[PDB]
Design a binder for this molecule. Structure first.
Ligand SMILES: [Ca+2]
Length: 355
């Protein structure tokens, strides 16, 4: 079945206008070759498949990169790639333009005899649909994030700082087996709760604060991503008002997302309600995006998206309202798209919790 991914990638070649592909992106390398290491490249023709790397990694590669010829280069990877392009008969070699640096582009082009053709999206098409094994891991990563939410509720009080909360979330997910958090944790309290991207700061949490907690677990190479907004003591009617709207919009999203909607449709489940209630101006981001090896990947549940959702897509549903000078709320779940609806894999409570 590393066999089968290679076969499915090869099926894309003619459309892309290539007879081979050079994969340099770490996520593509990990995805196609199950290589967890730091170095090396994958070179795949219509007929052969190679993992090229340095002396250090040869043992690891030979064990993980099952389905690949393990090729060891004697110092200069580009020179080895060029050697193998000629051995594989490749005449029109694809590369990943959205990762490959201009420098490495020039170096490769000079060295290699074939046409060197920019490509985008090839391994991404394969990663879009999660296998059952990937689903199991993502469920585990969500479980660890849920455990940390339940944990952190006994930690947040007035006088603790936002970074302190971020540090305890990081500590607890690791204790439960996460490699680490899956992105720079957001703990955004009081007026900062109006900042959708409010990475934890030195600010001290005070009574009356809404606190948005946006974090996830990086577990066996996969990412979860949960957001919950709690209150520390009694929140304002206006903050309560916004919370209720976000919650309701979010449930409409989870309840209505299914295979066959476009990204625009999926986003409209949440944005229709927030807009109807008069806060469209204040929902300045999309309803969500894909998650897997990366914290943000295809598809986009966004008003511009025409992408049709299919089973096995893993995505976030995360509407919010942000009013500068007042505060904000976001509530985010992770789901797996199914034929009929979806599966919510983040199960922490979404009701307003006052601490
Ligand atoms: Ca998020």
């Amino acid at each position: 079945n590393a066999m089968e991914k290679i076969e499915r990638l090869r099926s894309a070649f003619d459309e892309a206008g290539i007879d081979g592909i050079l994969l340099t992106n770490e996520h593509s390398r990990r995805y196609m070759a199950n290589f967890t290491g730091t170095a090396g490249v994958v070179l795949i023709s219509k007929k052969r498949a190679q993992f090229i790397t340095d002396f250090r990694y040869v043992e690891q590669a030979s064990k993980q990169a099952v389905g690949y010829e393990i090729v060891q280069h004697a110092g200069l990877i580009i020179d080895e790639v060029a050697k193998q392009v000629k051995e594989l008969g490749i005449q029109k070699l694809g590369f990943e333009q959205d990762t490959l640096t201009y420098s490495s582009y020039s170096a490769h082009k000079e060295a290699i005899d074939a046409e060197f053709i920019p490509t985008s999206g090839l391994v991404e098409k394969l990663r879009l649909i999660k296998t059952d094994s990937e689903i199991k891991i993502l469920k585990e990563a969500a479980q660890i994030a849920d455990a940390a939410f339940e944990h952190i509720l006994s930690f947040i009080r007035p006088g603790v700082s936002e970074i302190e909360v971020s540090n305890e979330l990081e500590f607890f997910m690791r204790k439960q087996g996460a490699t680490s958090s899956s992105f720079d944790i957001i703990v955004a309290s009081g007026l900062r709760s109006a900042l959708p991207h409010g990475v934890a700061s030195e600010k001290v949490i005070e009574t009356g604060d809404f606190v948005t907690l946006d974090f996830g677990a990086y577990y066996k190479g996969y990412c979860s991503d949960i957001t919950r907004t709690i209150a520390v003591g009694e929140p304002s009617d206006k903050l309560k008002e916004i919370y209720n709207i976000v919650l309701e919009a979010q449930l409409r999203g989870v309840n209505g997302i299914k295979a066959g909607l476009t990204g625009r449709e999926a986003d409209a489940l949440t944005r229709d309600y927030i807009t109807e209630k008069g806060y469209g101006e204040y929902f300045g981001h999309s309803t969500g995006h894909g998650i897997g090896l990366e914290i943000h990947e295809a598809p986009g549940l966004a008003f511009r998206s025409d992408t049709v959702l299919e089973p096995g897509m893993a995505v976030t549903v995360e509407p919010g309202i942000y009013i500068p000078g007042i505060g904000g709320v976001r509530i985010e779940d992770d789901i797996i798209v199914t034929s009929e609806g979806n599966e919510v894999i983040t199960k922490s409570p979404k009701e307003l919790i006052i601490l």
